[PDB]
PDB file of C-alpha atoms in Angstrom:
ATOM      1  CA  UNK J1017     -14.834  23.973  37.383  1.00 15.92           C
ATOM      2  CA  UNK J1018     -13.564  24.439  33.827  1.00 16.40           C
ATOM      3  CA  UNK J1019     -16.343  26.694  32.496  1.00 14.93           C
ATOM      4  CA  UNK J1020     -16.006  28.849  35.596  1.00 16.19           C
ATOM      5  CA  UNK J1021     -12.276  29.216  34.909  1.00 14.91           C
ATOM      6  CA  UNK J1022     -13.057  29.969  31.258  1.00 13.43           C
ATOM      7  CA  UNK J1023     -15.205  32.983  32.095  1.00 13.05           C
ATOM      8  CA  UNK J1024     -12.544  34.283  34.501  1.00 13.76           C
ATOM      9  CA  UNK J1025      -9.885  34.328  31.789  1.00 13.26           C
ATOM     10  CA  UNK J1026     -12.125  36.265  29.392  1.00 13.69           C
ATOM     11  CA  UNK J1027     -13.109  38.728  32.121  1.00 13.10           C
ATOM     12  CA  UNK J1028      -9.441  39.641  32.487  1.00 15.10           C
ATOM     13  CA  UNK J1029      -8.415  38.854  28.908  1.00 13.83           C
ATOM     14  CA  UNK J1030      -5.576  36.652  30.169  1.00 15.26           C
ATOM     15  CA  UNK J1031      -5.661  34.125  27.321  1.00 15.22           C
ATOM     16  CA  UNK J1032      -2.308  35.263  25.956  1.00 14.34           C
ATOM     17  CA  UNK J1033      -0.790  35.154  29.440  1.00 16.69           C
ATOM     18  CA  UNK J1034      -2.085  31.659  30.238  1.00 15.82           C
ATOM     19  CA  UNK J1035      -1.129  30.284  26.836  1.00 18.33           C
ATOM     20  CA  UNK J1036       2.375  31.645  27.328  1.00 19.08           C
ATOM     21  CA  UNK J1037       2.779  29.951  30.712  1.00 20.97           C
ATOM     22  CA  UNK J1038       1.958  26.653  29.018  1.00 21.13           C
ATOM     23  CA  UNK J1039       4.635  27.312  26.403  1.00 18.20           C
ATOM     24  CA  UNK J1040       7.259  28.042  29.056  1.00 20.12           C
ATOM     25  CA  UNK J1041       6.383  24.880  31.005  1.00 20.09           C
ATOM     26  CA  UNK J1042       6.255  22.696  27.867  1.00 21.15           C
ATOM     27  CA  UNK J1043       8.733  19.827  27.565  1.00 23.09           C
ATOM     28  CA  UNK J1044      11.762  19.901  25.292  1.00 24.50           C
ATOM     29  CA  UNK J1045      13.472  16.803  23.955  1.00 21.72           C
ATOM     30  CA  UNK J1046      16.010  16.125  21.217  1.00 20.70           C
ATOM     31  CA  UNK J1047      14.983  15.703  17.571  1.00 22.62           C
ATOM     32  CA  UNK J1048      18.287  14.480  16.156  1.00 24.84           C
ATOM     33  CA  UNK J1049      16.937  12.068  13.553  1.00 21.56           C
ATOM     34  CA  UNK J1050      14.618  14.820  12.301  1.00 22.85           C
ATOM     35  CA  UNK J1051      17.575  17.170  11.854  1.00 24.14           C
ATOM     36  CA  UNK J1052      19.857  14.803   9.892  1.00 21.67           C
ATOM     37  CA  UNK J1053      20.751  16.240   6.446  1.00 20.15           C
ATOM     38  CA  UNK J1054      19.355  13.165   4.681  1.00 19.19           C
ATOM     39  CA  UNK J1055      15.908  14.001   6.064  1.00 22.20           C
ATOM     40  CA  UNK J1056      15.735  17.679   5.105  1.00 25.92           C
ATOM     41  CA  UNK J1057      13.214  17.017   2.317  1.00 25.49           C
ATOM     42  CA  UNK J1058      11.025  14.902   4.590  1.00 24.96           C
ATOM     43  CA  UNK J1059      10.133  17.880   6.770  1.00 24.33           C
ATOM     44  CA  UNK J1060       7.630  20.542   5.731  1.00 24.79           C
ATOM     45  CA  UNK J1061       8.703  23.008   8.397  1.00 20.84           C
ATOM     46  CA  UNK J1062      12.165  23.594   9.839  1.00 22.14           C
ATOM     47  CA  UNK J1063      10.682  24.426  13.258  1.00 18.03           C
ATOM     48  CA  UNK J1064       8.239  21.482  13.510  1.00 15.89           C
ATOM     49  CA  UNK J1065       9.981  18.201  14.287  1.00 17.19           C
ATOM     50  CA  UNK J1066       9.073  14.973  16.095  1.00 14.67           C
ATOM     51  CA  UNK J1067      10.990  14.231  19.330  1.00 15.31           C
ATOM     52  CA  UNK J1068      13.252  11.194  18.846  1.00 16.53           C
ATOM     53  CA  UNK J1069      11.737   9.321  21.784  1.00 15.04           C
ATOM     54  CA  UNK J1070       8.192   9.365  20.449  1.00 18.10           C
ATOM     55  CA  UNK J1071       8.660   9.422  16.670  1.00 19.77           C
ATOM     56  CA  UNK J1072       7.000   6.896  14.373  1.00 21.81           C
ATOM     57  CA  UNK J1073       9.496   4.689  12.595  1.00 24.52           C
ATOM     58  CA  UNK J1074       8.819   3.424   9.074  1.00 26.12           C
ATOM     59  CA  UNK J1075       9.578  -0.303   8.840  1.00 27.55           C
ATOM     60  CA  UNK J1076      12.319  -0.060   6.225  1.00 29.34           C
ATOM     61  CA  UNK J1077      16.060  -0.642   6.567  1.00 27.51           C
ATOM     62  CA  UNK J1078      16.910   2.297   4.308  1.00 28.01           C
ATOM     63  CA  UNK J1079      15.550   5.452   5.967  1.00 24.60           C
ATOM     64  CA  UNK J1080      12.916   5.015   8.691  1.00 25.93           C
ATOM     65  CA  UNK J1081      12.147   8.713   9.011  1.00 23.30           C
ATOM     66  CA  UNK J1082       8.807  10.455   8.782  1.00 24.31           C
ATOM     67  CA  UNK J1083       7.725  13.601  10.602  1.00 22.58           C
ATOM     68  CA  UNK J1084       5.132  12.004  12.905  1.00 23.18           C
ATOM     69  CA  UNK J1085       4.746  11.431  16.646  1.00 23.82           C
ATOM     70  CA  UNK J1086       2.923   8.874  18.788  1.00 21.90           C
ATOM     71  CA  UNK J1087       0.934  10.626  21.528  1.00 22.98           C
ATOM     72  CA  UNK J1088       0.088   7.995  24.191  1.00 21.08           C
ATOM     73  CA  UNK J1089      -2.443   9.055  26.809  1.00 24.76           C
ATOM     74  CA  UNK J1090      -2.020   6.375  29.453  1.00 25.22           C
ATOM     75  CA  UNK J1091      -4.974   7.353  31.659  1.00 28.69           C
ATOM     76  CA  UNK J1092      -7.440   8.089  28.860  1.00 31.93           C
ATOM     77  CA  UNK J1093      -6.530   4.769  27.239  1.00 29.36           C
ATOM     78  CA  UNK J1094      -6.135   6.530  23.913  1.00 29.47           C
ATOM     79  CA  UNK J1095      -3.353   7.013  21.368  1.00 31.57           C
ATOM     80  CA  UNK J1096      -2.962   9.265  18.337  1.00 32.33           C
ATOM     81  CA  UNK J1097      -0.331   9.713  15.680  1.00 30.52           C
ATOM     82  CA  UNK J1098       0.105  13.399  14.856  1.00 32.51           C
ATOM     83  CA  UNK J1099       1.852  14.083  11.573  1.00 33.28           C
ATOM     84  CA  UNK J1100       2.408  16.935   9.129  1.00 31.93           C
ATOM     85  CA  UNK J1101       0.335  17.207   5.983  1.00 29.02           C
ATOM     86  CA  UNK J1102       2.378  14.961   3.663  1.00 28.99           C
ATOM     87  CA  UNK J1103       4.734  16.399   1.054  1.00 31.36           C
ATOM     88  CA  UNK J1104       4.893  15.665  -2.689  1.00 33.18           C
ATOM     89  CA  UNK J1105       7.642  13.172  -1.884  1.00 33.69           C
ATOM     90  CA  UNK J1106       6.376  11.677   1.413  1.00 34.40           C
ATOM     91  CA  UNK J1107       2.904  10.516   0.344  1.00 33.91           C
ATOM     92  CA  UNK J1108       4.177   6.969  -0.039  1.00 34.93           C
ATOM     93  CA  UNK J1109       5.748   7.196   3.427  1.00 33.87           C
ATOM     94  CA  UNK J1110       2.520   8.563   4.841  1.00 35.04           C
ATOM     95  CA  UNK J1111       0.547   5.532   3.674  1.00 35.12           C
ATOM     96  CA  UNK J1112       3.345   3.164   4.660  1.00 33.21           C
ATOM     97  CA  UNK J1113       2.919   4.437   8.209  1.00 35.24           C
ATOM     98  CA  UNK J1114      -0.867   4.080   8.022  1.00 37.05           C
ATOM     99  CA  UNK J1115      -0.367   0.480   6.937  1.00 40.94           C
ATOM    100  CA  UNK J1116       2.390  -0.516   9.388  1.00 40.14           C
ATOM    101  CA  UNK J1117       0.681   1.126  12.353  1.00 41.74           C
ATOM    102  CA  UNK J1118      -2.578  -0.643  11.483  1.00 38.53           C
ATOM    103  CA  UNK J1119      -4.505   2.616  11.500  1.00 39.59           C
ATOM    104  CA  UNK J1120      -8.207   2.626  10.700  1.00 39.19           C
ATOM    105  CA  UNK J1121      -8.766   6.361  10.349  1.00 38.17           C
ATOM    106  CA  UNK J1122      -7.041   9.419   8.917  1.00 37.56           C
ATOM    107  CA  UNK J1123      -8.215  12.769  10.256  1.00 35.84           C
ATOM    108  CA  UNK J1124      -7.556  15.845   8.105  1.00 37.24           C
ATOM    109  CA  UNK J1125      -8.224  19.318   9.524  1.00 38.75           C
ATOM    110  CA  UNK J1126      -7.280  21.531   6.594  1.00 38.93           C
ATOM    111  CA  UNK J1127      -7.769  21.944   2.850  1.00 37.29           C
ATOM    112  CA  UNK J1128      -5.159  21.146   0.239  1.00 38.06           C
ATOM    113  CA  UNK J1129      -5.052  24.851  -0.586  1.00 35.61           C
ATOM    114  CA  UNK J1130      -5.602  27.649   1.934  1.00 35.66           C
ATOM    115  CA  UNK J1131      -4.895  31.380   1.641  1.00 35.20           C
ATOM    116  CA  UNK J1132      -3.822  30.798  -1.957  1.00 33.82           C
ATOM    117  CA  UNK J1133      -1.039  28.267  -1.306  1.00 34.92           C
ATOM    118  CA  UNK J1134      -0.528  24.523  -0.915  1.00 34.65           C
ATOM    119  CA  UNK J1135      -0.794  23.425   2.717  1.00 35.32           C
ATOM    120  CA  UNK J1136      -0.718  19.691   2.021  1.00 31.84           C
ATOM    121  CA  UNK J1137      -0.206  17.374  -0.973  1.00 30.04           C
ATOM    122  CA  UNK J1138      -3.217  15.720  -2.663  1.00 28.50           C
ATOM    123  CA  UNK J1139      -2.344  12.407  -1.034  1.00 30.00           C
ATOM    124  CA  UNK J1140      -5.578  10.521  -1.772  1.00 29.15           C
ATOM    125  CA  UNK J1141      -7.452   9.733  -5.030  1.00 27.04           C
ATOM    126  CA  UNK J1142     -10.308  12.053  -6.020  1.00 25.29           C
ATOM    127  CA  UNK J1143     -12.010   9.685  -8.456  1.00 24.24           C
ATOM    128  CA  UNK J1144     -12.886   5.995  -8.074  1.00 23.19           C
ATOM    129  CA  UNK J1145     -11.530   5.142 -11.550  1.00 23.10           C
ATOM    130  CA  UNK J1146      -8.254   7.023 -10.952  1.00 22.54           C
ATOM    131  CA  UNK J1147      -6.496   4.993  -8.250  1.00 21.99           C
ATOM    132  CA  UNK J1148      -3.071   5.992  -6.918  1.00 23.07           C
ATOM    133  CA  UNK J1149       0.058   3.881  -6.733  1.00 22.97           C
ATOM    134  CA  UNK J1150       3.004   4.766  -4.505  1.00 18.72           C
ATOM    135  CA  UNK J1151       5.962   3.021  -6.147  1.00 19.01           C
ATOM    136  CA  UNK J1152       8.501   3.812  -3.428  1.00 16.11           C
ATOM    137  CA  UNK J1153       6.440   2.044  -0.725  1.00 15.16           C
ATOM    138  CA  UNK J1154       4.621  -0.335  -3.094  1.00 11.15           C
ATOM    139  CA  UNK J1155       1.133   0.722  -2.006  1.00 11.16           C
ATOM    140  CA  UNK J1156      -2.130   1.128  -3.929  1.00  9.99           C
ATOM    141  CA  UNK J1157      -4.889   3.504  -2.844  1.00  6.39           C
ATOM    142  CA  UNK J1158      -8.440   3.570  -4.237  1.00  5.61           C
ATOM    143  CA  UNK J1159     -11.326   5.933  -3.548  1.00  8.08           C
ATOM    144  CA  UNK J1160     -14.236   3.567  -2.834  1.00  7.25           C
ATOM    145  CA  UNK J1161     -16.901   6.102  -1.851  1.00  6.37           C
ATOM    146  CA  UNK J1162     -17.273   9.667  -0.639  1.00  7.53           C
ATOM    147  CA  UNK J1163     -19.868  11.413   1.509  1.00  8.63           C
ATOM    148  CA  UNK J1164     -19.821  15.216   1.269  1.00  3.57           C
ATOM    149  CA  UNK J1165     -21.673  17.056   4.044  1.00  2.00           C
ATOM    150  CA  UNK J1166     -21.843  20.759   4.860  1.00  2.00           C
ATOM    151  CA  UNK J1167     -19.028  20.893   7.429  1.00  2.00           C
ATOM    152  CA  UNK J1168     -16.995  17.758   6.667  1.00  2.00           C
ATOM    153  CA  UNK J1169     -16.441  14.908   4.226  1.00  2.90           C
ATOM    154  CA  UNK J1170     -15.930  11.218   4.993  1.00  2.00           C
ATOM    155  CA  UNK J1171     -14.259   9.037   2.406  1.00  2.00           C
ATOM    156  CA  UNK J1172     -14.018   5.284   2.232  1.00  2.00           C
ATOM    157  CA  UNK J1173     -10.647   4.199   0.871  1.00  2.00           C
ATOM    158  CA  UNK J1174      -9.018   0.869   0.066  1.00  2.00           C
ATOM    159  CA  UNK J1175      -5.313   0.549   0.795  1.00  2.00           C
ATOM    160  CA  UNK J1176      -3.502  -2.427  -0.700  1.00  2.00           C
ATOM    161  CA  UNK J1177      -0.068  -3.778   0.150  1.00  2.00           C
ATOM    162  CA  UNK J1178       1.002  -4.786  -3.362  1.00  2.00           C
ATOM    163  CA  UNK J1179       3.792  -6.913  -1.889  1.00  2.00           C
ATOM    164  CA  UNK J1180       1.346  -9.272  -0.176  1.00  2.00           C
ATOM    165  CA  UNK J1181      -1.851  -8.272  -2.028  1.00  2.00           C
ATOM    166  CA  UNK J1182      -3.504  -7.732   1.347  1.00  2.00           C
ATOM    167  CA  UNK J1183      -6.078  -4.901   1.531  1.00  2.00           C
ATOM    168  CA  UNK J1184      -7.648  -2.741   4.218  1.00  2.00           C
ATOM    169  CA  UNK J1185     -10.436  -0.214   4.466  1.00  2.00           C
ATOM    170  CA  UNK J1186      -9.292   3.223   5.610  1.00  2.00           C
ATOM    171  CA  UNK J1187     -11.741   5.945   6.644  1.00  2.00           C
ATOM    172  CA  UNK J1188     -10.732   9.483   5.696  1.00  2.00           C
ATOM    173  CA  UNK J1189     -12.403  12.094   7.944  1.00  2.00           C
ATOM    174  CA  UNK J1190     -11.870  15.501   6.411  1.00  2.00           C
ATOM    175  CA  UNK J1191     -13.046  18.597   8.254  1.00  2.00           C
ATOM    176  CA  UNK J1192     -13.466  21.080   5.386  1.00  2.00           C
ATOM    177  CA  UNK J1193     -14.719  24.228   7.095  1.00  2.00           C
ATOM    178  CA  UNK J1194     -11.872  25.387   9.307  1.00  2.39           C
ATOM    179  CA  UNK J1195     -11.536  29.155   8.639  1.00  7.60           C
ATOM    180  CA  UNK J1196      -8.489  30.594   6.851  1.00 11.02           C
ATOM    181  CA  UNK J1197      -7.653  32.755   9.857  1.00 12.49           C
ATOM    182  CA  UNK J1198      -8.500  32.331  13.522  1.00 11.72           C
ATOM    183  CA  UNK J1199     -10.687  29.484  14.788  1.00  8.80           C
ATOM    184  CA  UNK J1200     -14.331  28.383  14.343  1.00  7.03           C
ATOM    185  CA  UNK J1201     -17.019  30.730  15.644  1.00  5.32           C
ATOM    186  CA  UNK J1202     -18.727  27.774  17.309  1.00  4.50           C
ATOM    187  CA  UNK J1203     -17.176  24.445  18.403  1.00  4.57           C
ATOM    188  CA  UNK J1204     -20.460  22.846  17.326  1.00  4.33           C
ATOM    189  CA  UNK J1205     -19.426  21.409  13.931  1.00  4.83           C
ATOM    190  CA  UNK J1206     -15.936  20.569  15.180  1.00  3.14           C
ATOM    191  CA  UNK J1207     -17.527  18.535  17.990  1.00  4.93           C
ATOM    192  CA  UNK J1208     -19.940  16.688  15.688  1.00  3.53           C
ATOM    193  CA  UNK J1209     -16.977  15.904  13.457  1.00  2.93           C
ATOM    194  CA  UNK J1210     -15.120  14.458  16.454  1.00  6.60           C
ATOM    195  CA  UNK J1211     -18.074  12.291  17.454  1.00  2.29           C
ATOM    196  CA  UNK J1212     -18.402  11.132  13.871  1.00  4.84           C
ATOM    197  CA  UNK J1213     -14.787   9.946  14.004  1.00  2.45           C
ATOM    198  CA  UNK J1214     -15.456   8.202  17.330  1.00  2.00           C
ATOM    199  CA  UNK J1215     -18.600   6.567  16.012  1.00  2.00           C
ATOM    200  CA  UNK J1216     -16.529   4.956  13.254  1.00  2.00           C
ATOM    201  CA  UNK J1217     -14.268   3.116  15.694  1.00  2.00           C
ATOM    202  CA  UNK J1218     -11.081   4.751  14.356  1.00  2.00           C
ATOM    203  CA  UNK J1219     -10.173   5.908  17.867  1.00  2.00           C
ATOM    204  CA  UNK J1220     -10.833   2.541  19.495  1.00  2.00           C
ATOM    205  CA  UNK J1221      -8.201   0.062  20.843  1.00  2.00           C
ATOM    206  CA  UNK J1222      -8.997  -2.756  18.410  1.00  2.00           C
ATOM    207  CA  UNK J1223      -7.243  -0.598  15.798  1.00  2.00           C
ATOM    208  CA  UNK J1224      -3.855   1.078  15.553  1.00  2.00           C
ATOM    209  CA  UNK J1225      -3.598   4.792  16.512  1.00  2.00           C
ATOM    210  CA  UNK J1226      -5.666   7.173  14.405  1.00  2.00           C
ATOM    211  CA  UNK J1227      -3.544   9.376  12.105  1.00  2.00           C
ATOM    212  CA  UNK J1228      -4.270  13.101  12.611  1.00  2.00           C
ATOM    213  CA  UNK J1229      -2.802  15.950  10.543  1.00  2.00           C
ATOM    214  CA  UNK J1230      -3.230  19.543   9.392  1.00  2.00           C
ATOM    215  CA  UNK J1231      -0.325  21.472   7.908  1.00  2.00           C
ATOM    216  CA  UNK J1232       2.275  21.296  10.691  1.00  2.00           C
ATOM    217  CA  UNK J1233       0.270  18.667  12.545  1.00  2.00           C
ATOM    218  CA  UNK J1234       0.472  20.463  15.900  1.00  2.00           C
ATOM    219  CA  UNK J1235      -2.026  23.339  15.901  1.00  2.00           C
ATOM    220  CA  UNK J1236      -5.445  22.208  14.674  1.00  2.00           C
ATOM    221  CA  UNK J1237      -4.406  18.569  15.100  1.00  2.00           C
ATOM    222  CA  UNK J1238      -3.583  19.404  18.708  1.00  2.00           C
ATOM    223  CA  UNK J1239      -7.078  20.814  19.154  1.00  2.00           C
ATOM    224  CA  UNK J1240      -8.636  17.535  17.976  1.00  2.00           C
ATOM    225  CA  UNK J1241      -6.595  15.272  20.258  1.00  2.00           C
ATOM    226  CA  UNK J1242      -6.845  17.582  23.271  1.00  2.00           C
ATOM    227  CA  UNK J1243     -10.630  17.892  23.058  1.00  2.00           C
ATOM    228  CA  UNK J1244     -11.193  14.156  22.607  1.00  2.00           C
ATOM    229  CA  UNK J1245      -8.980  13.087  25.539  1.00  2.00           C
ATOM    230  CA  UNK J1246     -10.385  15.665  27.978  1.00  2.00           C
ATOM    231  CA  UNK J1247     -13.965  14.658  27.135  1.00  2.00           C
ATOM    232  CA  UNK J1248     -13.030  11.011  27.507  1.00  2.00           C
ATOM    233  CA  UNK J1249     -11.412  11.723  30.888  1.00  2.00           C
ATOM    234  CA  UNK J1250     -14.509  13.556  32.119  1.00  2.00           C
ATOM    235  CA  UNK J1251     -16.366  10.299  31.378  1.00  2.00           C
ATOM    236  CA  UNK J1252     -14.024   8.036  33.323  1.00  2.00           C
ATOM    237  CA  UNK J1253     -13.231   9.929  36.527  1.00  2.00           C
ATOM    238  CA  UNK J1254     -15.488   9.870  39.566  1.00  2.00           C
ATOM    239  CA  UNK J1255     -15.113  13.644  39.632  1.00  2.00           C
ATOM    240  CA  UNK J1256     -15.393  15.007  36.056  1.00  2.00           C
ATOM    241  CA  UNK J1257     -14.671  18.556  37.220  1.00  2.00           C
ATOM    242  CA  UNK J1258     -11.103  17.497  38.048  1.00  2.00           C
ATOM    243  CA  UNK J1259     -10.048  17.305  34.382  1.00  2.00           C
ATOM    244  CA  UNK J1260      -7.495  20.097  33.915  1.00  2.00           C
ATOM    245  CA  UNK J1261      -7.142  20.874  30.207  1.00  2.00           C
ATOM    246  CA  UNK J1262      -3.879  22.800  30.715  1.00  2.00           C
ATOM    247  CA  UNK J1263      -2.480  19.742  32.497  1.00  2.00           C
ATOM    248  CA  UNK J1264      -3.671  17.377  29.794  1.00  2.00           C
ATOM    249  CA  UNK J1265      -2.125  19.596  27.119  1.00  2.00           C
ATOM    250  CA  UNK J1266       1.216  19.659  28.953  1.00  2.00           C
ATOM    251  CA  UNK J1267       1.113  15.865  29.134  1.00  2.00           C
ATOM    252  CA  UNK J1268       0.531  15.730  25.378  1.00  2.00           C
ATOM    253  CA  UNK J1269       3.413  18.123  24.688  1.00  2.00           C
ATOM    254  CA  UNK J1270       5.798  15.489  26.089  1.00  2.00           C
ATOM    255  CA  UNK J1271       5.195  13.582  22.860  1.00  2.00           C
ATOM    256  CA  UNK J1272       5.168  16.380  20.285  1.00  2.00           C
ATOM    257  CA  UNK J1273       6.124  20.050  20.351  1.00  2.00           C
ATOM    258  CA  UNK J1274       3.844  23.030  19.900  1.00  2.00           C
ATOM    259  CA  UNK J1275       0.468  21.300  20.220  1.00  2.00           C
ATOM    260  CA  UNK J1276      -1.973  24.270  20.233  1.00  2.00           C
ATOM    261  CA  UNK J1277      -0.309  27.122  18.348  1.00  2.00           C
ATOM    262  CA  UNK J1278      -2.182  30.197  19.618  1.00  2.00           C
ATOM    263  CA  UNK J1279      -4.154  31.563  22.550  1.00  2.05           C
ATOM    264  CA  UNK J1280      -7.158  31.520  20.191  1.00  2.00           C
ATOM    265  CA  UNK J1281      -6.695  27.781  19.662  1.00  2.00           C
ATOM    266  CA  UNK J1282      -6.346  27.298  23.418  1.00  2.00           C
ATOM    267  CA  UNK J1283      -9.545  29.233  24.112  1.00  2.00           C
ATOM    268  CA  UNK J1284     -11.229  27.273  21.334  1.00  2.00           C
ATOM    269  CA  UNK J1285     -10.177  23.996  22.959  1.00  2.00           C
ATOM    270  CA  UNK J1286     -11.822  25.078  26.225  1.00  2.00           C
ATOM    271  CA  UNK J1287     -14.954  25.954  24.279  1.00  2.00           C
ATOM    272  CA  UNK J1288     -15.058  22.556  22.616  1.00  2.00           C
ATOM    273  CA  UNK J1289     -14.532  20.679  25.886  1.00  2.00           C
ATOM    274  CA  UNK J1290     -17.007  22.765  27.895  1.00  5.18           C
ATOM    275  CA  UNK J1291     -19.593  22.657  25.108  1.00  3.28           C
ATOM    276  CA  UNK J1292     -18.838  19.006  24.403  1.00  3.63           C
ATOM    277  CA  UNK J1293     -19.328  18.136  28.063  1.00  2.86           C
ATOM    278  CA  UNK J1294     -22.849  19.583  28.136  1.00  4.05           C
ATOM    279  CA  UNK J1295     -24.051  17.442  25.228  1.00  4.37           C
ATOM    280  CA  UNK J1296     -22.145  14.317  26.277  1.00  2.69           C
ATOM    281  CA  UNK J1297     -23.886  14.449  29.576  1.00  2.34           C
ATOM    282  CA  UNK J1298     -26.738  16.966  29.828  1.00  4.13           C
TER     283      UNK J1298
END
């Protein structure tokens, strides 16, 4: 069982050891497009790049680059686009991707400012009467409504393709209580947040892949995607106890590097799955 394994690891404080084995086994693929000089300003971190084989391509003849990866979980029947928190100059690209990929939901796992510095650009409008226009990608974004709760905020946004005048409703799920350091004390709120995203249909097949991001779009974002898939798999399989989180994570790392940045995040993922399994079933 998973929970049984969990307790073993704590007993012997092997979290760092286990997490390191995952890192050593993790896939490695080229990221040539990401490294081209013309894309230097499109990357937030020099050590966080999308693999060429699974990168999202913007539908423009000029430069189709954006630091984002498509994570396709064949068995779970679920896909996610993991991306970095957009930059002052890639906000238009960010929404171009949301539009072209036909996404329904945007999942944000960080705050614009953390530990005193900017961890992501203010890419969405904060006031209904102050809409945003991205001239480079000819997109218009309008805050339609907002619902602030204790642990997260859900925003209703309208994205318009000014070229065609077509519009779409985009749901912004913003987890606002992730601690500055470490991980959450309890996976409880994180899990409710996840179910709230599910309940909205943003993760369902009738829509394009949900767009998930934090700062680098690999640590916290990894936690979200890993938890969701594992839980989903425990629902499909005849034998739910066969879901191996370390295996699932390795499968995900074939599509984007460094998903799950610390042993604390790994342990936290186990917690969320184990805890999420008890409510989802018991």
